[PDB]
Design a protein around this ligand. Structure first.
Ligand SMILES: Cc1cc2nc3c(=O)[nH]c(=O)nc-3n(C[C@H](O)[C@H](O)[C@H](O)COP(=O)(O)O)c2cc1C
Ligand SMILES: [Ca+2]
Ligand SMILES: [Ca+2]
Length: 145
C-alpha cells in the first residue's frame, strides 16, 4: 500500500508533523511519498491508496497562499475508493484553530474519499501528546489497508 502526503510549511512545524506521520507509516510497512504542495499535482493522489494533507492555517483566509492551487485542484477529483486523513499545525491563540484542517477535511469528503482516522490539529510545534495522536492517526490508517 502507498500513502501520499502533501504538506505546506513556512517555518517547519507542519513539515515535522508530515515527517512524523510518514516515518510511522514507513515503519508499519507502507510505501510513502512526502512532497511540498508546490512540487506536486493533487491528481498524484489518484495513484495512491491513502491521501494525506498536512497544513498550517494562516489568517482569515485560512489556507496558506502556496496551498491554494492544490486545494482547488483537489476539489475537482474523484477519490472514491481512496482513504484520506488530514493533520495540521496552528496556534490556539486563534479561535480558528487549525481551520485549514477542517477546510481540507470537507474538500476530501467532496471527492468521495473515505476518512480513515480523526483529523489531528497541533498547537504550534509538536510535543509528546501530538506524537501519540499522530502515531494513532497513522496506526488507524494503516489498519484500513
Ligand atoms: C499571520 C498569522 C496568522 C495566523 N492565523 C492562524 C489561524 O487563524 N489559526 C491557527 O490555528 N493558526 C494561525 N497561525 C498560526 C500558524 O499556523 C502556526 O504558527 C503554525 O505553526 C505555522 O506552521 P509552519 O511552521 O508549518 O509554517 C497564524 C500565524 C500567523 C503568523
Ligand atoms: Ca514525491
Ligand atoms: Ca474546479
Amino acid at each position: 500500500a502507498l500513502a501520499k502526503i502533501v504538506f505546506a510549511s513556512m517555518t517547519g512545524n507542519t513539515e515535522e508533523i508530515a515527517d512524523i506521520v510518514a516515518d510511522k507509516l514507513r515503519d508499519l510497512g507502507l510505501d510513502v511519498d512526502v512532497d511540498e504542495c508546490t512540487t506536486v499535482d493533487a491528481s498524484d493522489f489518484l495513484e495512491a491508496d491513502i491521501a494525506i494533507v498536512a497544513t498550517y492555517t494562516y489568517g482569515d483566509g485560512e489556507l496558506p497562499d502556496e496551498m491554494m492551487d492544490f486545494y482547488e485542484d483537489l476539489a475537482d477529483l474523484n477519490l472514491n475508493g481512496k482513504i484520506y486523513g488530514v493533520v495540521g499545525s496552528g496556534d490556539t491563540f486563534y479561535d480558528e484553530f487549525c481551520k485549514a484542517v477542517d477546510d481540507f477535511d470537507r474538500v476530501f469528503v467532496s471527492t468521495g474519499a473515505e476518512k480513515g482516522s480523526e483529523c489531528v490539529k497541533v498547537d504550534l510545534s509538536a510535543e509528546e501528546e501530538d506524537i501519540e495522536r499522530l502515531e494513532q492517526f497513522a496506526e488507524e490508517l494503516a489498519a484500513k489497508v
